[PDB]
């Protein structure tokens, strides 16, 4: 009884977790194909995405 109710609760929460993953990446992807930009050339495309990426700076040791 514990096994059935516990696994039902856990699959019930990861159902909406997976729903929200696919829905939110659909929302982001349809915004992207609505108005991201126009590059057909792969080199200019990859340089555009490298200039528009998220940067974070880290303190390394040499």
């Amino acid at each position: 009884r514990v096994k059935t109710e516990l696994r039902s609760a856990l699959k019930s929460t990861e159902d909406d977790l997976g729903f929200n993953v696919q829905g939110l990446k659909f929302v982001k992807q349809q915004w992207n194909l609505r108005h991201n930009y126009e590059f057909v050339d792969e080199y200019d495309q990859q340089e555009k995405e490298s200039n528009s990426a998220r940067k974070r700076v880290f303190g390394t040791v040499i």
């Binding site: 998220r54 974070r56 880290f58 303190g59 390394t60 040791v61």
Partner: protein, 50 residues
């Protein structure tokens, strides 16, 4: 470089350097070598870094 190679690389290392590294976010597919396969499809930035 040639002093280390001449010394047969028993040397004493460089002292210290707290440098500064910028990493952009990208798929770790793209951070790999050119081969048919892959090893991990994560993104190089953590959720707490995004």
């Amino acid at each position: 470089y040639k002093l280390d190679v001449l010394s047969s690389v028993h040397f004493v290392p460089k002292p210290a350097s707290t440098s500064l590294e910028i990493r952009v976010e990208t798929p770790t597919i793209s951070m790999e070598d050119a081969q048919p396969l892959y090893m991990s499809n994560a993104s190089s930035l953590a959720p707490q870094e995004i």
